[PDB]
Here is the input.
Amino acid sequence: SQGMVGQLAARRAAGVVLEMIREGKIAGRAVLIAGQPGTGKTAIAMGMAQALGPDTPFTAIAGSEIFSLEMSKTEALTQAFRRSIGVRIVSLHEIDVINSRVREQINAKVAEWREEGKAEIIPGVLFIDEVHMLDIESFSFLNRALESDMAPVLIMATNRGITRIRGTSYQSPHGIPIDLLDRLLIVSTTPYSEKDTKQILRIRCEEEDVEMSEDAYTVLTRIGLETSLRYAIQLITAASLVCRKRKGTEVQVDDIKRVYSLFLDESRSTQYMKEYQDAFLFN
Amino acid sequence: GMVGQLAARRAAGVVLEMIREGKIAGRAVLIAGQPGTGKTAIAMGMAQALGPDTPFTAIAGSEIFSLEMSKTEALTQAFRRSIGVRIHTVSLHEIDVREQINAKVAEWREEGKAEIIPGVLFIDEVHMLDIESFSFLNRALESDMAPVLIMATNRGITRIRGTSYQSPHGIPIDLLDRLLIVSTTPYSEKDTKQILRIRCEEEDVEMSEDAYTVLTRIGLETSLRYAIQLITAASLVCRKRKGTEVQVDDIKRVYSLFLDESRSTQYMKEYQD
Amino acid sequence: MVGQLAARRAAGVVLEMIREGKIAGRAVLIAGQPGTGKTAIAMGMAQALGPDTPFTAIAGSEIFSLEMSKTEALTQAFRRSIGVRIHTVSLHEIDVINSRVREQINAKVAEWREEGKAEIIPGVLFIDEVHMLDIESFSFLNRALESDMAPVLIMATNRGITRIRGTSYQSPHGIPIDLLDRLLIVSTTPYSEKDTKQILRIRCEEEDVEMSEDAYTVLTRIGLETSLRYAIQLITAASLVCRKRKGTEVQVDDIKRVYSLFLDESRSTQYMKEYQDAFLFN
Amino acid sequence: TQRIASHSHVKGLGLDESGLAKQAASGLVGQENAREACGVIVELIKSKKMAGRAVLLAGPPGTGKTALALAIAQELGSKVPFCPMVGSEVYSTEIKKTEVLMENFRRAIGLRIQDVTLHDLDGEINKVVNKYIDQGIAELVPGVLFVDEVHMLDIECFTYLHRALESSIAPIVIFASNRGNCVIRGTEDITSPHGIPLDLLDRVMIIRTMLYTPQEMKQIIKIRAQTEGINISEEALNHLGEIGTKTTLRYSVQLLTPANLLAKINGKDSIEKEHVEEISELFYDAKSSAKILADQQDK
Amino acid sequence: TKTQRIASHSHVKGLGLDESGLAKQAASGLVGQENAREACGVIVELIKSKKMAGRAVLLAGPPGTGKTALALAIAQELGSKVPFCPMVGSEVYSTEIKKTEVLMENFRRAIGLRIIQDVTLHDLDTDKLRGEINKVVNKYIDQGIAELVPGVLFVDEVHMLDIECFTYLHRALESSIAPIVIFASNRGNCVIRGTEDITSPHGIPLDLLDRVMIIRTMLYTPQEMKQIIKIRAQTEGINISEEALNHLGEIGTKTTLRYSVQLLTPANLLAKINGKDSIEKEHVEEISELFYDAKSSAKILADQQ
Amino acid sequence: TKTQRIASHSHVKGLGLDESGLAKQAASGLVGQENAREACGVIVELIKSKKMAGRAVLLAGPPGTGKTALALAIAQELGSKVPFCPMVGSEVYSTEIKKTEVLMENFRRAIGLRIIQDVTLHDLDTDKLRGEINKVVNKYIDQGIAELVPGVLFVDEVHMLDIECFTYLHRALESSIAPIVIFASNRGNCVIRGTEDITSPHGIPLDLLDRVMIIRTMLYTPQEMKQIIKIRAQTEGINISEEALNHLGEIGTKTTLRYSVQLLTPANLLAKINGKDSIEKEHVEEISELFYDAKSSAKILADQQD
Ligand SMILES: Nc1ncnc2c1ncn2[C@@H]1O[C@H](COP(=O)(O)OP(=O)(O)O)[C@@H](O)[C@H]1O
Ligand SMILES: Nc1ncnc2c1ncn2[C@@H]1O[C@H](COP(=O)(O)OP(=O)(O)O)[C@@H](O)[C@H]1O
Ligand SMILES: Nc1ncnc2c1ncn2[C@@H]1O[C@H](COP(=O)(O)OP(=O)(O)O)[C@@H](O)[C@H]1O
Here is the structure.
């Protein structure tokens, strides 16, 4: 159903918020998505964005992406909201870059454009990935952002516990100050169980034009549960060329236990270095 | 307008004659008080007695943490502010090129309508000046127009701002070997009644002679200014029972309401822990 | 130059590796305590390499300049080490005569290589106490030395496995671990009791000092307890205390008296622990 | 306007004639200790004897330290200005610290003829308004500047506030600090109560506000429900009074707008206990949501 | 074209593979590492079979095991004279040029443009200089004439790279004209640079670690410590005896292989001094006592102070 | 020129040494310290024969011993009107004048020259302008008449010189137009300001410490602590009893000697207030227990906190 496998309650959590926007009761709030990484917290917002009409704007940006050396965060954040403003014909991020080279000029100009109506203001949805590495003065811009009536519905995402804020020396929950934190809604996500992962491997192999046997799935569902999903996807295309070497006709279990014992996860390679400095750095 | 301080007032007379006999050029005064011992009027204790025209300025040691202007250019205005010339004795900030005013007043001295005078300059919360500004008063004291600098702190053996070593009072040793450090012994029980009898008269309050004996029993463990904030609100609560004067049940009505800084950091230890 | 049997012999193998061009891509790192003359077995690679080789004895702490920037205290020091033979002139003084700029000269000197009227010469650059440098300056030795107009680097460091400045990753001698894979690390040794007298029977001849033979054997008894920095510093002060009664040579108490007058670098700070760490407890 | 949309049930502070505090009146419930105390403060501005000082509302978060700031701005004439700023709204890099600290400060003083504040009119700006008092055409009504989260203001902007409150025409400002003996921002070594330095501690009346009971919490979420027009039942409200005493009140008031629309998802108009039993699992608070990432990491 | 950094890797000439994707023992230069040389084989097939949409490799082994050699074999098994630009981690920090351009000085210098003149996309030379060059060469591959031959970028000691490089590099690989990038490391969990806050495996953020296929190289047995010195001796003409090689493999297993392979040319030019052209054991002891190594010469400076 | 840095020690005339190479009990405005007073006599001998091969003096010893006094007796034993210009460790930081200028300011406040009219090198006055001077005054010394006498710089509490000022001085002391510079400190193995991990003795870098000669200044006994306050009294024209010196000396043993010299001026002024002839045993106790010193007044801000 519509690409999004699993996370049934946390997808229904959007269905609460999807009527908070149509009733007109989000104007000031914001939505956060917590969770262990590799779960779909970068993906629930997409189907969330599609459910406000056919042509909603959507701008997934990252929190470590704020380190732009040509583009200051006073202007990186400011066009980011204006890449989520509805203009019917073409958002406001592309308007000022050619028609001007101002941000108070087009708003007074769209104060004139509100009454004609060839383009109607439907401000869409944002997504700001990895908010736990977003500086403190950027959060104060988010407070000043949602004060226009042409505001977008902010969606955020964090994967860190009680940490410090980026700019101060206070340990606080999630790495957000508590001027926005208690105004936030926490759509929490859970890591997949056994049965949830082996549909995803069936999904990713279906769209990679890769044929696979049934017994290759249950070993890759052991690994896909333990290590990650995104490492188990990487072994799919690697085992699709250890099968093709013997020409295969189907990918098998020892065509995984070759490759799973050939490459490594994001986990074991550190552990090989752990017992490597036990006489090196313990002499 | 003191109360008490049977020793540290007497030190202000010994320091006062050093301004007369000229034996103060190079030295300064350190007032190592508590916050609520009233050092600022003792700083004026040699400004109402040295000269009636000798000016003063009170700039905090945290005021130099400035965002509009630099640290020391804002200081040098407040250092020149204490030095006047008789005409009303006009300060050296209102004649404000930076050395021409110094060179012009090197001429005006013998004329008859302009004569140089020293002044008093008060730096409170002195331990928030870094070593960049302690080097400024290391050299600005050695000029021909040295005001009687009085420094006020409430910090013991601490780290200097700008360096990382230990030091008394936030002062580096080069401006501390040659200082007069006076101690202000804190207020006492007969010392606290007389200040509180002064303070009610300054807000047209008739007070009891027994609710004082609890207000001075309450104005010791907390602060003095806590017993000051009460006594203008202790007037209003008897202005709502319509009794025209304040008795012993009336402070413990408003002592229950308005907390102090010591029963409101322990009450942020009950919840927060 | 007396001493260093196990450091000059390896330095000869450093030397004759330059002659076959096999040194191209590497550098030398003389690891040892100071006072062992790390600027003496590094200038031997300027004496024995040839009498016309430029040799610059900068320090690593001397890159700390407020009037400079951290790309001109080294680009001068390489061009004050590489040179051009055409009274040989170094390459840095070619920048002076074209100023009253390297985007024109280093092609122009490369033009000279085909005629040979001006000949390039490989020099030697000495960067003493290089552990004070940092990765924003270590990355220029990986950036200039890989060129073909390059000298042979010689570094020196007494610090062990310490933190590199710039990061918080510890490493031997404060150098990046990428640069330490091409260093020729030759150690120096502490001196010997028969060998320590040789520098003192050559420092006495610097200022014609006549010294009794018990005094030599007690100054080396002094010099190997504390320092050779300090034992040289009592030579001259033995003279103008012997010129009271004129001596005809300094004596045993006469070098023991001035040893009681001046104090060396590590005994004197032991008296601060008798004061600074013994007033805090009381 | 959303900054006071969470306080659209306070039409006054709710005191009787004898200067005492009653339980439930004009919106405010519980809190009868400190509502005596902010009755003293509003009477010390009606008598002009507030000689350059402020109010600090110590206590845990969510207990109502902002609703009194609108209550004091209600009892003082109810047409006064009000600008609740937060101590993290100053830390912006597009503008300086002090001007965005003063832009709210020049918005609190109400002038009376039209109803204007100083920020519409924004040294010489300070004097022509002082000239109009001399003629008697416009008299200033000092409103309430609420500074929440005051430990996030540094010592470089506090001494600005120790100056812009030292002048005569400044309004009453009200701090709110939900922490203890904090360490002052911007100075790296010195500590003081509530993150407010000593030079400003001489001008504050520390009014403590205490926590709530589950009985007091059930009254208030009814009032926020009855103002938004969302019919909730007592079995549902008792759960919100146990989610209230679990985390905060600010979380439990926040769930009224989504948990009503969960019945609109299900077709009904009212909130029952089975709805809030689901939306506690759908949306979380902030403290337990960092417990999960401390569990899914440390599992 | 800096032909100095790969001077010691002149002896590798491929991967030394069988027909069905199995490693040999000793062919095309390398000896041993046959567990990881299989993993290079399935990697190099993917770059040929176009299933490498912007993905990277991170070899993860101790210092002295062949991480740079095994990422030159991936450069040559794609083809000979295929561009290969090895940089290191602490080379991006220049006070002259900004550090983001220094990666573009390398990440663009690992492509082979094919017209026949062959050139790198860097050597066609300011984000317009990066941007507008891409749309002409994107027109070139659909023009039915021209083509790129993507090479190998090699970043060693990656934990010195900071977060302003990682975010630019990961955002750079979304272009279709992006060559492969092969990382390296020698440590476990280590904090990121550029933000200096929290830990991460091998100094790699999770924004890049979903493009990472970790290949683990192992250590070397003392038997493997001898052929690898032998092949590096046979390229430089170093006539060395077995009784000294058994001492020289002892050096490679006492500290490191990279140290025990740069000892040869001083030990060859010590034997040219003594006269015997063929190296014996009497030289290579007196080059391991005269010269030292970093973890043993930091110990000596601790053995006095 | 400044005078108040010298006026507190306006009673020392020379080192007070007989020609037998030794010292005495007390002479020439000095007392005690017989180990260190010969050593400064050795250094003033090594300026006379110029065997100082770019060296310097470090005076390591506790505060309240006369390290400013002995390095002023050196500056007067060279001759009358030999320049002297002491600075402290935290002088070299100012927003008005940066680090290496104010070093060279006091470095060239010391360098005297006799062209007959007495001149310094800071009389003549941007290091390009400084190095321009050095060659042409290296002509005037080799014209024969214009002989220069080297002044004595005195750096007090040398630890607060950071690392980017020391190596300037190592590139400034190496000239032959240099004055003899005298460092002084009492700190232990001090971290140099700028390196954060290097433990070097009295805060001197390991290259500059190859030039200096460390002399101890030993703390006084209360016998010799008494005679100095008598000597400092009689230059002021301020009389005193005996037992007051048995108090002012035996309170100087308690904290410092640097404190007690700041008490002759108020305790005499306590006698002018009360109309007394001189200072006596109660006049000190109404200043000693009324005024305070920072090593014994910072304890009362910790006792009142606890
Ligand atoms: N005693 C009270 N009377 C009326 N409303 C209250 C009371 N306490 C809390 N509230 C309501 O509960 C919410 C939380 O109070 P507030 O002080 O804003 O939380 P915080 O302490 O997090 O700022 C507010 O919206 C306020 O309207
Ligand atoms: N398996 C191997 N086959 C051939 N040569 C090797 C092998 N492993 C290491 N070497 C040689 O040893 C040296 C160290 O390899 P390299 O990867 O460059 O350093 P490190 O192993 O420390 O990353 C290289 O010069 C390489 O030529
Ligand atoms: N042995 C001494 N002989 C003469 N004067 C002394 C002696 N000891 C101290 N003084 C005087 O005491 C004062 C303190 O000496 P100074 O060196 O300035 O302080 P410190 O010893 O703490 O550095 C000096 O001005 C000096 O004149």
